[PDB]
Amino acid sequence: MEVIELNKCTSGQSFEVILKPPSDPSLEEIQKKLEAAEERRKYQEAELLKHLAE
């Protein structure tokens, strides 16, 4: 049971008590995956319109 790093001020108080010691993707890569999803949307809609035209 040890108390360390005790700091005090007007607002409060903080300390540490020890009981036992121990033993990213770039903007381009993101734009491509977003634009890839938009292509699959546009392709699925084109097939729908092609189907409706028939």
Binding site: T10, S11, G12, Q13, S14, F15, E16, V17, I18, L19, K20, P21, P22, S23
Partner: peptide, 15 residues
């Protein structure tokens, strides 16, 4: 506690 970490508590008090 896990073996690779101390068994303790960091305490903070706001009055």
């Amino acid at each position: 506690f896990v073996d690779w970490c101390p068994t303790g508590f960091k305490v903070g008090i706001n009055y």
